[PDB]
Design a protein around this ligand. Structure first.
Ligand SMILES: O=[N+]([O-])c1ccccc1O[C@@H]1O[C@H](CO)[C@H](O)[C@H](O)[C@H]1O
Ligand SMILES: O=[N+]([O-])c1ccccc1O[C@@H]1O[C@H](CO)[C@H](O)[C@H](O)[C@H]1O
Ligand code: NA
Ligand code: NA
Lengths: 988, 988
């Protein structure tokens, strides 16, 4: 019985536990004076849906092509119409039976013709910096080998195969392979040759690999330099010239430069250098820095650093995994502009070019090997490749290539074995190899909590509580006494925290307080830097981002791929604005009397000499006083009290009580930096003289009784409902109590703990908060003042099939100019349902106005949204925006746009403007209803209906981060309760 | 402070705990020779959306009508374009704050002008037989009163207010009222005057109320007759003439008729009678029957009866609660035609006309008062009206009116206090009143399990297990010793069981076995008789039923209103067909050797003399032998063995082994009955000589190898997939394993018990059964016979992100005429997921054929569908239907149409037909895919895609009744396992 199935050969290679075949050794990516020819451009592409019908028709030659077509290389090929993106979070998109590949497996045949001059002879190589996920390579029909590790680099000796003149390079790329089982990151499955292809000549007497070792002696200030160079794996003679430090030395020997300026992310000093031999010179930037762990702290150059970090994925909304270099230096300067000083390359090494930019601009980076086996957790880690001895070779090759490529860059301060890969023998072999190859950086891996084979203790989304226990080193002890002693001596890092999906993330301040208070806490990396939105052009031609499912997936994880501080096009979300203020590197506590302010330098190395300290006093109309104050530089981790000019304090003292004014002390960039122009704001602080409470109007005007309506000054009531129908000509279509909001992404998440496993959003639906109803109980006039009268409208708010309720008593008084509105809420019945207390989103009013709103202005926090557990970035001021820029363009629309702590507010409606005053309320103004916003799954599903939805909230919930990790914290949860609050309105 | 809200007066009447105002006493509905004028016809109608804007503009007069329009009366008015039906199951459609009514409360103003002749003077009354839910009545602008209890009757004295000639009658009808809180049945909320309006003259010396008392002495055969008559509540002189029994007697005296033929549902003997006084005669039908409880059995006329019952709601797909009398006698004759002998009027008294038809046609009925407070359960029965002393008067009035109207009808054998109303003081007062007023019928109420105030123990959906424990009186004892002693002495009835939603109900046979085995078990009433589908005409003009939500509800319960044995138009579902055979009143066990058959008479009173006993022998082509056999009548609960003609046995013996033939003994109606023509089938039984197994083809034909395809006789394989591409010209687009089916309604239900709270349908989605995938492992030819060869195609079936799998090995042999196909399935891995074992719907194959199928024929069970725990109604035979009549037109489409126990099968595809043979398999043939059927929410969402979906199942799950009650029973659950099965195909 002989076998008759097609394609058995390709499939057995794809299902291989072995690493690629026939490539050269792993080495650093080096800047070399050898000639190079980038084969990037416009290739030819043919796509077959499986190895069983992938033609073996000699396409690899370049002759008689049938069924090819122009495609760009580098590309993620489902971004150019061939198939589609497919998004899965933890679930594998194929049956889990390693190492087998599904029958449906896109095969992409790639072909380019190039010219090879005499520079590339007698010796050259081809270099592929990234092939997702398994490539086979032919040069002139001759097999060069295979690539494994989709974001790793492979090099192939083409000596004797590369011909002079015209060559034909052919690569066959399979989307799925056994390697898929170990590349299960939470991102888009996008196959292709997404990184540079390059021909490089290899002259004789060259340099293949260089290993820079540039340490720093913080007690003496010495550099410690030893540049190793090698050819064909042997130490070679080469000369090391670093001009600026006045040294020439031999490669291979360690020397003590007498005094160097150390490298950090605050001061990223880079000495230019070259190592050269007869046939080849190599350029290097060199940062003198030394990483160590002592007294359970993570120290750089002798000082405990604080990691203000994010998790950078490589994604672009129209090119997939290809990220244009202009987009890279833009997003990285964006990061510095928001006080970020660390980056973690979740969850694979980045583009080779990325490393030098982290060296230059200034970031502590965690360089992470391409390894993740998350999809195996659901089966209790059965068959997990991290513990299958059949994968040792494959995984150690991923670590070697990872380490080798980037070992020379001072910005990488940690190697990371990978992510969400379980525990296992192979992980320990990856650690063992790395400690041997590069003892100079400590080793990170979160997935083995025992921390046996790492040097730092690392967790994701550990609660603010557990983080305080670890900060004091009193977390519960490991079962192994020996292991526990080790882990207790490591510093602690959160590689992922404050999950920034949608509206949020809440609770950042609580985490930051612990980072400053506890030295064993290293800091943390927000999840994540960007959303992976993929732009989708509609029939109309409107643009919007699509997410998981939108592209036809059979299994997918929805909008969980859009969970970042910036959108796919790097437009900041309010979370970035908040985070920037949270991690701000100086704190400015402005004194109540406006005489000075305390300045703490929170940096680890720099002093304050880089910063101009400006102040301004803003009153209602314009600025009253402003300028600059000179601060004698304060050391890192030192504090001074700096006086402000006496004019500022005298101005505060002479304010008529109840007149608002805000003192803002800014710290801005004295001079341009590599990442921002002079005057860029780094840190700030404020003191506010508040307005007094608003004067309730005298109830001098009485209540006029028509048969169908009532009238009390400028407000028109309906005798059937009790609610206002107009105020000063402004049509009022509805007025009621609100307790609910269109759920955020965190509200859609399950908050672990509590026997209530339903998401808050579900809790609400079950409770009926989204479908409240109001019964009218009574309407009265009552003795006012000098003939005038108050109006009291009694209602009860509740929901169908529910016994709990709230009584709401609206009480109006008017003098003819301003309407007064007192609102009282009292609970009737226990607000219990399906066994669990109900929690409210808010305690407010919804005014539905009959006309459109063009412009919203307020006094309070701003300019961007704020909620109880967010809003740190929103300062006290006077703001004014067009309605459409009050919204927040989240990909799945949801509750956003509340401006908390608001004191006054004006909506410009056609010709008239509507002025609310009162004690602190949260303002929100949208052109569509809450239910339109809740049902909407993408932004085009939001349509204005010509009215205005005015939200005035006397209380709000926090937002938390329950979509992944901690929910709203106790101090910010909103339990049902009685409440009382006063407003005053006015139309002009 | 004086109150300024509109409509405070109507609302305080609507919110009233009191019963109607100013009507005459509750009395029986009587056939009287007094003149009557039905005000039914075409009324005028104005609809206001709340009492606060219901005009008080003197519409009640009939002059200057503004905003009225022609409407039929009786009507449910949302069936005629005014508003819409709204379906809620247990949830109230308004905030639960009794007695308050929501602001949104349709007010329907009704007006008719009629002519009153001299017959109606000086004394007459108006009679409303039903007003949902609160009516106010004016005759010539003069208030007559108010109605409460939507399916109860009210009568108003119009003496001195009804004028001669032309009158104007005005009724204002509010949909919601305090009474809504006690009318929360699981049905459509439809307001209006849905039952007859009638003017009736009341001559002097008349009869107002009559109370028939017609018992039976089963030891002597005597009738015991006493007809009470009364006027203005006092016993009056009247004469009682029952011609047929040769008696004239005075009303008020009890007499002993020497010998009467008793009344039962099997023999509903009705003696015509009249009671008359000077001004009025009243006609009566009189059934002599006596109900008693002894030895914990429910006995009628001395014999323990068995209740073969259903729950009749009053519903019509286009008229709502109005059920045309032709539809009533049709549905009731339908019921008799399916062996039903009992009816329960869930959950309100029916149309007055219904009672006489139950007397005549023959049904034990449970007459149920309009009371149900289900929506209060979710709050722990807080504020439940059954225990609020403020409702005593309202509820006792509902019981009185209920009892009074129908007390004279022998078919009612139980009064029922209501349904799903909790326990409470008012319920006990309802019971106390009823025992006093009418001691002759026992009292039913399920909602108080202690059974303190009832005479029978009644439950819903108690499992087959608990029912056997009760059958033996060994259920766990009540906490109160005294109560427990009472309940243990009552007989037991299931007022609702075997929930017949969608495909089902499964498990009827298990219940029936217990009914026969245990005398304390009275029987049961299927839930429910009909679906409440409401027809919806689409733009195309296609008709289909809509259900909850489809009409715009804010809260609703989906398709739970369509849960019956017949659809809204009384077209039978397969459940009725099964149920008819289950409850069949004789059992015919046909002997294996075909010499005779055992006959048990299961009736309680009749013998077999009504039945012709026919037999037929059916072979492949036509009938071989047939006729009639004479059975000496067997008593109720007796058995005989009746010989069949010797020709029948000799025919069986002379059959060549492996030739199929079926002996069917039928018991049909010898002569016409009030409910069916002669020859109607009542009970049947069969013995089958099976076919032998099919001969596997000799593998004489070899496997031809092209580069792209294989060929083995008439079958064409694809070398890439391994699956057949054609068999005898018939395009085969896909062939694979099936383990899943589009979930039924029961599969969508939560099966209580087991820590798995997810519905089976959810279990499956979580497990991936709906999205299986097949990887190909190998293909071989192998040594066959005389040059020929088998083909073995090895696959593995599984699902993305899952480790469990099944290996499937397809093995084909051919001789050139017939294809042989052996299929083997073996488990690889534990089929566990989210902590709970996965269960399969089936173990079968899905053939997707490229051409349409016109006609399906098979040998096996039929003609209607069958599944392991259903299909009793399907007999052994030869059947043949067009494809579209293989389907089942469920309102939410779902898994149906499997014909289990099938031996052979032919699909006619254009010109050729495809013949499957093999051991018992379950056949199914649909014109659309399973996923089309699962996604479809209504029948118009099913569209044929031009192909054929052939389902051959070697194993199946039962269907159960998990949508309400027990799921699939143990013996019918399908756990994963290895399996082996052989098929043979053939194309002509
Ligand atoms: O770490 N976890 O316990 C965990 C629980 C639920 C979902 C994701 C998850 O892991 C984390 O999720 C984030 C953000 O979505 C990223 O995908 C990250 O790579 C992953 O480690
Ligand atoms: O009786 N029950 O415990 C129960 C549990 C869940 C849903 C309905 C239910 O009660 C029963 O349901 C049926 C069929 O849907 C009818 O509505 C019936 O009137 C009701 O008593
Ligand atoms: Na994510
Ligand atoms: Na139902």
């Amino acid at each position: 019985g002989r076998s008759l199935e097609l394609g058995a050969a390709d499939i057995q290679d794809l299902e291989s536990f072995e690493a690629g075949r026939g490539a050269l050794p792993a080495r650093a990516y080096l800047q070399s004076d050898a000639p190079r020819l980038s084969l990037n451009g416009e290739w030819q592409f043919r796509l077959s849906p499986g190895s069983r019908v992938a033609p073996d028709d000699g396409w690899q030659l370049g002759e008689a092509l049938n069924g090819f077509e122009s495609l760009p290389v580098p590309s993620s090929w489902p971004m150019h119409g061939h198939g589609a993106p497919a998004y899965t979070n933890v679930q594998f998109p194929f049956a889990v039976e390693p190492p087998h590949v599904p029958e449906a497996n896109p095969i992409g045949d790639h072909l380019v013709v190039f010219e090879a001059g005499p520079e590339f002879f007698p010796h050259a190589l081809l270099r592929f910096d990234g092939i997702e996920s398994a490539g086979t390579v032919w040069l002139n029909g001759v097999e060069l080998g295979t690539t494994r590790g989709s974001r790793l680099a492979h090099e192939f000796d083409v000596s004797g195969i590369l011909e002079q003149g015209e060559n034909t390079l052919a690569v066959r790329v399979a989307q799925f392979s056994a390697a898929s089982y170990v590349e299960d990151q939470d991102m888009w499955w996008l196959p292709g040759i997404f990184r540079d292809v390059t021909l490089q000549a290899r002259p004789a007497a060259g340099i293949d690999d260089v290993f820079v070792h540039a340490g720093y002696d913080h007690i003496t200030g010495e550099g410690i330099l030893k540049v190793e160079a090698s050819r064909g794996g042997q130490a070679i003679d080469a000369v090391v010239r670093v001009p600026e430090l006045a040294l020439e030395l031999a490669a291979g020997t360690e020397v003590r430069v007498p005094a160097v300026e150390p490298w950090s992310a605050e001061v990223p000093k880079l000495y230019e250098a070259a190592v050269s031999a007869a046939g080849e010179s190599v350029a290097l930037q060199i940062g003198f820095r030394s990483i160590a762990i002592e007294d359970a702290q993570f120290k750089v150059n002798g000082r405990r650093i604080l990691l203000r970090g994010v998790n950078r994925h490589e994604h672009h909304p129209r090119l997939g995994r290809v990220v244009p270099r202009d987009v890279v230096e833009a997003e990285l300067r964006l990061m510095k502009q928001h006080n970020i000083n660390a980056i973690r390359t979740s969850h694979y090494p980045p583009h080779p070019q990325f490393l030098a930019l982290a060296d230059q601009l200034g970031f502590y980076v965690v360089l992470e090997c391409d390894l993740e086996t998350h999809g195996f957790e659901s089966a209790g880690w059965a068959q997990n490749p991290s513990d299958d001895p059949q994968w040792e070779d494959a995984l150690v090759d991923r670590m070697r290539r990872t380490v080798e490529r980037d070992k020379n860059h001072a910005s990488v301060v940690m190697w990371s074995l990978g992510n969400e890969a379980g525990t296992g023998r192979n992980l320990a072999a990856m650690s063992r190899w790395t400690k041997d190859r590069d003892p100079s950086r400590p080793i990170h891996y979160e997935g083995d909590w025992s921390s046996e084979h790492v040097d730092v203790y690392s967790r994701m989304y550990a609660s603010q509580a557990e983080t305080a226990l670890i900060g004091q080193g009193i977390e519960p002890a490991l079962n192994d006494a020996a292991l526990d002693a080790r882990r207790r001596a490591m510093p602690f890092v959160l590689c992922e925290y404050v999950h920034a999906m949608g509206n949020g993330p809440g609770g950042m301040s609580e985490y930051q307080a612990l980072f400053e208070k506890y030295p064993r806490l290293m800091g943390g990396f927000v999840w994540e830097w960007l959303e992976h939105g993929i732009t989708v052009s509609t029939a109309d031609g409107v643009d919007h981002y699509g997410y998981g499912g939108d592209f036809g997936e059979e299994v997918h994880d929805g909008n969980f791929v859009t969970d970042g501080l910036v959108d796919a096009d790097r437009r900041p979300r309010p979370g970035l604005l908040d985070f920037k203020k949270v991690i701000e590197p100086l704190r400015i506590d402005v004194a109540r009397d406006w005489t000075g302010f305390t300045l703490r330098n929170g940096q680890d190395f720099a002093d304050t000499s880089a910063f101009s300290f400006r102040y301004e006093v803003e009153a209602d109309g314009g600025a009253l006083d402003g300028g600059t104050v000179d601060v004698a530089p304060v050391a890192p981790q030192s504090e001074t009290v700096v006086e402000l000019p006496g004019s500022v304090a005298a101005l505060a003292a002479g304010l008529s009580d109840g007149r608002p004014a805000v003192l803002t002390v800014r710290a801005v960039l004295g001079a341009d930096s590599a990442w921002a122009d002079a005057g860029h704001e780094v840190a700030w602080g404020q003191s506010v003289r508040e307005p007094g409470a608003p004067v309730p109007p005298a109830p001098v005007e009485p209540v006029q009784v028509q048969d169908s309506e009532l009238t009390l000054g400028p407000v028109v009531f309906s005798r059937a409902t009790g609610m206002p129908t107009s105020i000063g000509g402004v049509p009022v279509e509805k007025l009621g109590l609100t307790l609910w909001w269109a759920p955020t992404d965190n509200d859609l998440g399950r908050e672990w703990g509590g026997a209530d496993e339903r998401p808050l959003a579900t809790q609400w639906k079950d409770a009926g908060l989204n479908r409240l109803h109001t019964r009218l109980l009574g309407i009265s006039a009552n003795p006012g003042q000098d003939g005038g009268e108050t109006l009291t409208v009694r209602t009860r708010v509740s929901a169908a099939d529910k016994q709990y309720g709230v009584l709401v008593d609206y009480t109006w008084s008017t003098d003819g100019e301003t309407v007064g509105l007192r609102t009282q809420v009292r609970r009737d019945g226990t607000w219990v349902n399906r066994g669990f207390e109900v929690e409210w989103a808010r305690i407010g009013l919804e005014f539905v106005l009959g006309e459109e709103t063009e412009l919203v202005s307020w006094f309070g926090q701003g300019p961007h949204q704020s909620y109880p557990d967010t809003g740190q970035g929103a300062r006290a001021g006077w703001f004014s925006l067009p309605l459409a820029k009050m919204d927040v363009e989240y990909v799945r629309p949801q509750e956003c746009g509340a401006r908390s702590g608001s004191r006054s507010a004006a909506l410009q409606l056609g010709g008239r403007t509507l002025e609310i005053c009162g004690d602190p309320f949260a303002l929100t103004v949208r052109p569509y209803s809450q239910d339109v916003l809740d049902a909407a799954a993408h932004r085009p599903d939001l349509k204005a209906d010509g009215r205005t939805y005015l939200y005035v909230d006397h209380a709000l919930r926090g937002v938390g981060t329950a979509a992944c990790g901690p929910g709203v914290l106790e101090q910010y949860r909103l339990k049902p309760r009685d409440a009382d609050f006063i407003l005053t309105l006015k139309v002009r």
